[PDB]
Amino acid sequence: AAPVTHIWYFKGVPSRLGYLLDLAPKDLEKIIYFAAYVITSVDEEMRHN
Amino acid sequence: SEALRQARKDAELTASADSVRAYLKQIGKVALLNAEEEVELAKRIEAGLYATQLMTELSERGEKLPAAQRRDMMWICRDGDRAKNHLLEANLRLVVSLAKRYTGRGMAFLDLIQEGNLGLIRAVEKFDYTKGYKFSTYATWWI
Amino acid sequence: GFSEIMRSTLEKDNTVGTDEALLDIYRKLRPGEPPTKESAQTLLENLFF
Amino acid sequence: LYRRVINRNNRLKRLIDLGAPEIIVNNEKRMLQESVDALFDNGRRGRPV
Amino acid sequence: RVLRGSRLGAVSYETDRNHDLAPRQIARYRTDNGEEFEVPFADDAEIPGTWLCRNGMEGTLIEGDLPEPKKVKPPRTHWDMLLERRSIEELEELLKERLELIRSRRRG
Numbered sequence: 001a002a003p004v005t006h007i008w009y010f011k012g013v014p015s016r017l018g019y020l021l022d023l024a025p026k027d028l029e030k031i032i033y034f035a036a037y038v039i040t041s042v043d044e045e046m047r048h049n
Numbered sequence: 050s051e052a053l054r055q056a057r058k059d060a061e062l063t064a065s066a067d068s069v070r071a072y073l074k075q076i077g078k079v080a081l082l083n084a085e086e087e088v089e090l091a092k093r094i095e096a097g098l099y100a101t102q103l104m105t106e107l108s109e110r111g112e113k114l115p116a117a118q119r120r121d122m123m124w125i126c127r128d129g130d131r132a133k134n135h136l137l138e139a140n141l142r143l144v145v146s147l148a149k150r151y152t153g154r155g156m157a158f159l160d161l162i163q164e165g166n167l168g169l170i171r172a173v174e175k176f177d178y179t180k181g182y183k184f185s186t187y188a189t190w191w192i
Numbered sequence: 193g194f195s196e197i198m199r200s201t202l203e204k205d206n207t208v209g210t211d212e213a214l215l216d217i218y219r220k221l222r223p224g225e226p227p228t229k230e231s232a233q234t235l236l237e238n239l240f241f
Numbered sequence: 242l243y244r245r246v247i248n249r250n251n252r253l254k255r256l257i258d259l260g261a262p263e264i265i266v267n268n269e270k271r272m273l274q275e276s277v278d279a280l281f282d283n284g285r286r287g288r289p290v
Numbered sequence: 291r292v293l294r295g296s297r298l299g300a301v302s303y304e305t306d307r308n309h310d311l312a313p314r315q316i317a318r319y320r321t322d323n324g325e326e327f328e329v330p331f332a333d334d335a336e337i338p339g340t341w342l343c344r345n346g347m348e349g350t351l352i353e354g355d356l357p358e359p360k361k362v363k364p365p366r367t368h369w370d371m372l373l374e375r376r377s378i379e380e381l382e383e384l385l386k387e388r389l390e391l392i393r394s395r396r397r398g
Contacts, residue, residue: 096381098368100385101369125389177375
């Protein structure tokens with residue numbers, strides 16, 4: 001019902017998700033295990049003008 | 050004074066790999082209620098259900114619904130929904146109150162807590178206030 | 193009295209007042225918990241005694 | 242393991258269909274994540290099931 | 291000491307005759323999200339209208355029958371649970387009370 005991250009690409013060291021997104025793994029765990037939000041998109045031009 | 054608040058915040062925002070502890074610390078944010086709060090929330094929820102019911106009354110051609118009636122009816126409905134969610138969010142702690150003692154046989158503990166929460170939704174749905182009993186006395190059965 | 197390294201560390205002990213550490217100990221006793229500086233005293237007199 | 246994942250999936254599905262407050266649904270998605278993670282490589286993150 | 295088990299299924303062993311087979315039709319079913327799935331049914335068999343196809347969702351037959359889309363009502367609403375324990379007049383009372391409440395609280 002809601003997508004999931006294969007653990008081999010998240011908990012391995014180094015974490016391939018961590019690299020392909022360029023995130024700190026201990027700040028990726030808060031992202032995927034529902035411990036801390038993350039801004040996924042933003043409307044740069046609107047916030048600009 | 051606030052020096053210990055540094056510890057209280059840093060230790061609050063720590064690793065805590067245990068998902069059980071995570072969910073406990075999560076539910077702990079919203080505080081409990083008392084009788085008048087529960088009564089008024091039940092009234093808000095009933096008002097909200099009747100507002101949405103009357104809206105689907107007007108879903109068929111019942112009126113060119115004016116702007117004022119639209120705005121305050123939508124406010125009524127959204128208030129009912131917010132209060133309904135507020136009530137569950139208040140009593141989640143009770144749900145763990147018991148699930149705490151059906152563990153250790155068969156199932157995990159988060160599973161028991163979620164099943165309790167679903168029953169809690171049923172309980173709030175079917176909860177009456179006019180009988181004037183405390184909420185937990187009626188909710189414990191369904192949980 | 194004779195305790196050379198003791199007095200040395202007691203000069204670099206960088207923490208004064210009993211309650212002062214009790215909270216050190218606590219805080220590190222377990223991570224992630226609001227201490228009750230007065231109340232965690234029992235935790236100590238309740239691990240070893 | 243499969244029973245755990247299927248149960249948590251069905252429960253998430255019924256919670257969403259029912260309409261549930263955000264806290265419970267996030268808890269459920271986290272349980273689903275942990276369950277699939279235990280399915281793939283057990284006790285990699287956390288305490289093994 | 292030995293301990294034997296057994297899957298709950300027999301093992302019939304004829305020969306896999308590839309030639310003499312009961313002839314069979316093919317019924318192409320469609321799911322909802324534009325998926326085409328095909329099913330070899332036996333010839334003499336009423337090709338059922340609906341089907342839980344391989345895709346997992348519901349699957350309809352390719353033709354047009356619609357004997358009954360649903361023919362079934364929702365289980366019970368929170369509206370149901372509420373209505374069966376109150377009166378419409380009471381609900382209207384609480385509604386108009388909320389109306390007066392928002393009015394007096396916002397616009398004086």
